[PDB]
Structure 1
Amino acid sequence: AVVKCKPTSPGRRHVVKVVNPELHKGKPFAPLLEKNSKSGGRNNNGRITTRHIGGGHKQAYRIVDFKRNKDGIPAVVERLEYDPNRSANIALVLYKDGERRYILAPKGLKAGDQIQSGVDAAIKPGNTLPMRNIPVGSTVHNVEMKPGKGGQLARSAGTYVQIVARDGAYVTLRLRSGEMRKVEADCRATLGEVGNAEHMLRVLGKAGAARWRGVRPTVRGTAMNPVDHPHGGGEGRNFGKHPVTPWGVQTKGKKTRSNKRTDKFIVRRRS
């Protein structure tokens, strides 16, 4: 449910928030929490290597199961929880032996639903099976690229992957970008879409809301001096050159993919 705020102040006029009342109002499950301290976009040399990262709210890391290899044992969904580390919501499940795990919460999944992993599970949203046992045409998410490695594709809120063909030991996937990719058929996938599909409907409204997420302000290169950026300089507003990065590489159109060992898996690039 998206709600518009009322314009009681100029920083509240444009705020549109996504409020989900079925989330757990309470503390998260403590044995699956870890420390996660912030970086500032700096590496082990101490240098800024990614700009515009800094500050934000303190966050604890939730150990989410991306593998889903606890085969054969059923699990009941206890509740849905907020995760500050990702765009999607997470679900706390309880297996029959008494193990608790966090999974990504799919679309339409409530508290009390029954999920099951493994090779002989049923085709319903929330179950994780290898893709040689999934019908062609299904909508899946949390897709593995290597068998046993863990899910890596279609993890963000509202995303999914369609299974277009199965030919031999490989399946062809239509990725969310529009790219056709071959992945081998022994890799796992979870049925359904990722939940929280109106995450892209929210409006931050004010500059401080971006600072709460650890995003620092972007300075335009044309607003600098020539010593700082290629776009810098001018007596007034001058541009005069082709648009480039801060390191002089042409942006706005120039391709940067250079990976000769993975090109055989890509059937069609995005358009």
Structure 2
Amino acid sequence: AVVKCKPTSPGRRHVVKVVNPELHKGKPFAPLLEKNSKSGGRNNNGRITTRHIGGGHKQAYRIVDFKRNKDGIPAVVERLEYDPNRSANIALVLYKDGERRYILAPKGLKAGDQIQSGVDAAIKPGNTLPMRNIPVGSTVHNVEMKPGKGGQLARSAGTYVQIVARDGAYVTLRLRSGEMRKVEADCRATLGEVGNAEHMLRVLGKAGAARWRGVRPTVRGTAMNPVDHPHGGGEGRNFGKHPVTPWGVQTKGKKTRSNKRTDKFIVRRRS
């Protein structure tokens, strides 16, 4: 649900939050949790390499099954759960042999729903099959790029991929960005759309909500001095320059892809 907050204070006036009453209210499943500590955007030289990262709430890591290779064994969803690490919700499924795993929660999946993976799984939301067993035109997510590597595409909340054609050992996919991509038919995919499509409807409402997520303020290049940024300097507000990154590369339209190794697998760029 998408509910607007009443304006009892200036920081609350514009807040729009997503309330999903179905989510588990207790703690996560402990055997599948992990520590991950924060980087502040610093690499192993101790240098900031991605700006605007730091602070935020402590987060535990949930081990999610992106491979979905437990073939031929049905499982039952016990509960949906909040995952601080990603936009999508996650589902704790219990396998009939007594094993528990987390999966990305497909749209419309809920407690009690049965799921399965394998070449003989039914074509229903939540089931993972090799894409040479999924009909052309289907809506899939958690798509593999290399067989057995694990799902890598269409993982974010509300995302999905369309199988548009099958040609030999490769399938053509329409990605969320509009790109048409080839990938081997033996790559796996989960049927349906990633759930929590209302995620994009939230409004943080104030600076503090972004600070809670570990996002640090962005200082505009034009507010700096010339020593700091190519946009820096000027008496009053002045620009008179072609807009560039802090490292001086044009940032309004210049293409930066250079991967000849993978150029073959792209059919039509998102363009």
Tell me whether the two structures share a fold, i.e. TM-score over 0.5: yes
Q: What TM-score do you get using the length of structure 2 for normalisation? A: 1.00
What is the CA–CA distance in structure 2 between the aligned matches of 1:191 and 1:177, rounded to whole Å? 19
What is the CA–CA distance in structure 2 between the aligned matches of 1:9 and 1:121, rounded to whole Å? 52
| Structure 1 residue 220: Cα displacement | 0.3
Structure 2, unaligned stretches of length 5 or more? none
| Structure 1 residue 127: Cα displacement | 0.3
What is the CA–CA distance in structure 1 between the aligned matches of 2:258 and 2:206, rounded to whole Å? 39
| Structure 1 residue 65: Cα displacement | 0.2
- SS of residue matched to 1:209: helix
What is the CA–CA distance in structure 2 between the aligned matches of 1:116 and 1:257, rounded to whole Å? 38
- SS of residue matched to 2:197: coil
Q: What whole-Å deviation, never above 9, does each CA across 1:3-62 have from its counterpart, x for those lacking one? A: 000000000000000000000000100000000100000000000000000000000000
Q: What whole-Å deviation, never above 9, does each CA across 1:156-199 have from its counterpart, x for those lacking one? A: 00000000000100000000000000000000000000000000
| Structure 1 residue 101: Cα displacement | 0.2
Cα RMSD of the aligned pairs, angstroms, is 0.3
| Structure 1 residue 208: Cα displacement | 0.3
| Structure 1 residue 236: Cα displacement | 0.4
Cross-structure match for 1:108: 108
- SS of residue matched to 1:198: helix
Does residue 2 (structure 1) correspond to residue 13 (structure 2)? The answer is no
- SS of residue matched to 2:209: helix
| Structure 1 residue 112: Cα displacement | 0.2
Q: What whole-Å deviation, never above 9, does each CA across 1:216-236 have from its counterpart, x for those lacking one? A: 000000000000000000000
| Structure 1 residue 129: Cα displacement | 0.3
What is the CA–CA distance in structure 2 between the aligned matches of 1:13 and 1:35, rounded to whole Å? 35
Cross-structure match for 1:224: 224
| Structure 1 residue 136: Cα displacement | 0.3
Spell out the pairing of 1:248-259 with structure 2 (5 A cutoff): 248-259=248-259
| Structure 1 residue 148: Cα displacement | 0.3
Q: What whole-Å deviation, never above 9, does each CA across 1:107-148 have from its counterpart, x for those lacking one? A: 001100000011101000000000000000000000000000
Structure 1, unaligned stretches of length 5 or more? none
| Structure 1 residue 91: Cα displacement | 0.2
Identity of aligned residues (%): 100
What is the CA–CA distance in structure 2 between the aligned matches of 1:174 and 1:3, rounded to whole Å? 33
State how many pairs are aligned: 271
Q: What whole-Å deviation, never above 9, does each CA across 1:72-130 have from its counterpart, x for those lacking one? A: 00000000000000000000000011000000000001100000011101000000000
What is the CA–CA distance in structure 2 between the aligned matches of 1:152 and 1:109, rounded to whole Å? 20
Divergent runs of 4+, >2 A: none
Cross-structure match for 1:137: 137
| Structure 1 residue 213: Cα displacement | 0.1
- SS of residue matched to 2:210: helix
- SS of residue matched to 2:10: coil
Q: What TM-score do you get using the length of structure 1 for normalisation? A: 1.00
Cross-structure match for 1:202: 202
